[PDB]
Amino acid sequence: FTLIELMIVIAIVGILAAVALPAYQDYTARAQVSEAILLAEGQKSAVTEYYLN
Amino acid sequence: FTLIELMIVIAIVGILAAVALPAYQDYTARAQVSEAILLAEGQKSAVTEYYLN
């Protein structure tokens, strides 16, 4: 008898595929969301520039 | 794990927008306040001119 050793595999086979993937496509999103933010960084002072002058 | 690298961005994203902007719209004001002063410069001697003669 070994099957419970196979059972535990197929328990490992059914993986979670952690929410630490989709919370980190949401924070990979935070990466390229930031890529949008880093654009905004340029306009921060330029928009400001119009706003002040 | 990298998120603290994203955290620190969004700490950089929330910028100060330094008071060295509004203290220097107040001193940009000092520029065009001076533009009013540089007008006054002409009247300094002309007002004086009436005052003396």
From Swiss-Prot, chains A, B:
Disruption phenotype: Deletion mutants show a complete absence of observable pili. It is found in: Fimbrium; Membrane. The chain crosses the membrane at residues 1-21. The O-linked glycan identified as Gal-GlcNAc disaccharide in PubMed:7477282 and PubMed:10048019 is now identified as either a hexosyl-diacetamidotrideoxyhexoside (DATDHex) by mass spectrometry in PubMed:15249686, or alpha-D-galactopyranosyl-(1->3)-2,4-diacetamido-2,4-dideoxy-beta-D-glucopyranoside (DADDGlc) by X-ray diffraction in PubMed:16949362. It is not clear whether there is a chemical difference in the glycosylation of the two derivatives of strain MS11 used in these experiments, or not. The modification N-methylphenylalanine is found at residue 1. The pili are polar flexible filaments of about 5.4 nanometers diameter and 2.5 micrometers average length; they consist of only a single polypeptide chain arranged in a helical configuration of five subunits per turn in the assembled pilus. Major component of the type IV pilus (T4P) that plays a role in cellular adherence, microcolony formation, resistance to neutrophil mediated killing, twitching motility as well as transformation. Mediates the attachment and the formation of bacterial microcolonies on host epithelial cells. Mechanistically, pili retractation induces host NF-kappa-B activation in infected cells, which is temporally associated with the formation of gonococcal microcolonies. Belongs to the N-Me-Phe pilin family. This is Type IV major pilin protein PilE1. The chain holds residues 8 to 60 of 165 of the full protein.
